[PDB]
């Protein structure tokens, strides 16, 4: 359904306003939610006070 | 699914009376007319017509619940005048006035139309 014009989205019984972006898995549309995390490859100096450490240079 | 059918606001069931008079006991010469399947259309003209009667000491109407189709009209008159005839005379002349208003609207139409 790609680069396909608007008559043809409607000839395949689809809507041209559908955004896309989801999977059909056993006839269910599933979305992948974006998960955040920490940036890798970067030095971060924190300070946990609830331990034996004054500082911590994670990476 | 619990919706009442819409003809239930004007159609009388089987056994319901249209109108029902109950003598009121707190004050002398007072009655309560309970009209079924009516609303503020008919209850307001009668009350305002009864307040024109000089021998009527109290007149009012209420609608106890709006989901239910019943009004109560409480009339109190002076001891030489029962509220049964106050309520009757308040309708007889309300009729005479509506009939006269109809005659006059009809001649005013047929004069406006080409005239």
């Amino acid at each position: 359904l790609n680069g396909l014009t608007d008559r043809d989205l409607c000839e395949l019984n689809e809507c041209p306003l559908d955004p896309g972006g989801y999977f059909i898995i056993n006839g269910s549309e599933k979305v992948l939610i974006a998960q955040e995390k920490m940036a890798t490859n970067t030095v971060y100096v924190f300070a946990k006070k609830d331990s034996k450490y004054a500082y911590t240079g994670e990476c | 699914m619990n919706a009442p059918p819409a003809f239930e606001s004007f159609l009388l069931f089987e056994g319901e009376k249209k109108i029902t008079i109950n003598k009121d006991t707190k004050v002398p010469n007072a009655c309560l007319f309970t009209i079924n399947k009516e609303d503020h259309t008919l209850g307001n003209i009668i009350k305002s017509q009864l307040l024109k009667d000089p021998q009527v000491l109290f007149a009012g109407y209420k609608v106890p619940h709006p989901l239910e189709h019943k009004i109560i009209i409480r009339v109190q008159t002076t001891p030489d005048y029962s509220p049964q005839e106050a309520f009757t005379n308040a309708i007889t002349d309300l009729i005479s006035e509506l009939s006269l208003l109809e005659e006059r609207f009809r001649v005013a139409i047929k004069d406006k139309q080409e005239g």
Binding site: - | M1, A3, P5, F7, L11
Partner: protein, 59 residues
């Protein structure tokens, strides 16, 4: 019973001319599930008249 499950048509009283399928009938009344509204009313069994739904010519 006898008319349970048949299509009737209410022919008197406030629901005149209203179509539904009988769900439960007794000797006196019947419960008609009305076709338009979403409701099952209980009507007298003499206010009803069977309409039926059949096809002829079966060939």
């Amino acid at each position: 019973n006898e008319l349970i499950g048949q299509t009737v048509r209410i022919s008197q009283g406030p629901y005149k001319g209203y179509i539904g399928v009988v769900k439960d009938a007794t000797e006196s009344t019947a419960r008609v599930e009305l076709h338009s509204t979403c409701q099952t009313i209980s009507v007298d069994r003499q206010r009803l008249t069977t309409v039926g739904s059949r096809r002829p010519g079966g060939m």
